[PDB]
Symmetry: D2
Subunit: 122 residues, 4 copies
């Protein structure tokens, strides 16, 4: 699924995920969020199963963005965990954890959870 995953993806929020899948299991690219304390592109890196089951199962993958670039620093990081599903309407279905840096007193309230679905068309 190197070919299937590599490319430009869009989620339901209007965010843009640009990724290259390497033969070895690497994910590298950029992410641009349509929402939040974010502007322009941010580095992302991650990993995917480069030899997935051939029983029609999805391909497990995940990636991280730290929300610091040359424009802004939101002192936070999001990780997406999910699976790539190939076919006519390819999809990456994810759930995510967004942690922001906090004091120890506020650590209980440091992590948001959500879900994003990416497609190859906006």
């Amino acid at each position: 699924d190197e070919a299937g995953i590599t490319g430009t993806w869009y989620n339901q929020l209007g965010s843009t995920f640009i990724v290259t899948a390497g033969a070895d299991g690497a994910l590298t690219g950029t992410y641009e969020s349509a929402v939040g304390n974010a502007e322009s592109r941010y580095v992302l890196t991650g990993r995917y199963d480069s030899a997935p089951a051939t029983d029609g199962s999805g391909t497990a993958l995940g990636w991280t963005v730290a929300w610091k670039n040359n424009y802004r620093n939101a002192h936070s990081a999001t990780t997406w965990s999910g699976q790539y599903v190939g076919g006519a309407e390819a999809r990456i279905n994810t759930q995510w954890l967004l942690t922001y840096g906090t004091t120890e007193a506020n650590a209980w309230e440091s992590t948001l959870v959500g879900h994003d679905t990416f497609t190859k068309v906006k």
Copy 2:
């Protein structure tokens, strides 16, 4: 926190996280899980806030492991999202999402969630 993060960390399960933090926000290393469908080391990559707040807040970070190496393929990936807290007893406090590849029918049951705390001593 490049110096603070780089090194060998251990969680409550007895897993070993070996990481290098780059000046640019990169995380690269290996992970060895004490539990699950896992043996020996797996590649990890991730990101951290390389210019965190100086108000005593933690440093946000995250990373991904795809559970394929030369020994096993568990057709799954975990992402950890959390913060590094420096000091005498440094800690990385995380929550994680483990997704495994599934059929579309079983996708509702594809993702485990948990929490790991890493310290510099086992």
Copy 3:
């Protein structure tokens, strides 16, 4: 939103959530899952914000099902946390945690996470 919430709801899996919202903030009803180790109806109870903001915000709510009834016992419980959104296409948008009973050794793998969206039509 007592009137808005009370009734029969369906999610994307084909599950059926039958709920009564009380004036005091109570949720009581039954849940029937289309998937998993489940058959027929299970008791549910929960709570909702009975005086929500009137700035167009959703109404926060949550509920629990333990997966034991007269037919089956899956030694597990799910909680849904989410918000009710009123209007022509009313929705309850949720994320959920499903914990199953485990040994202490397997507790790291005890909890699934997902997301369900309920509507008033299947």
Copy 4:
């Protein structure tokens, strides 16, 4: 585990969970949070597995608090999902989802996730 669960529990934040477990699987009680937009006691309800496995597994359970009482309304609800572990140092180990009411535009940022461990001594 009716007897084991019923009583007063405390988490790592200093919150107080007061619960009665019914023979039928009901949980009913009050919760007082040491943190957040909260004061005094809030109603809780939930469910537990009233016939758990006898292979040394934990007992699955969950409960909900809507954060409205006579003092405050935080327009939010938390659900805890977890398992009760009996013995000399009884514990309830949970993960939780806290959703607050939002506009549709801000729904992506509506849900916090965390983990609480309750014991019978503070």
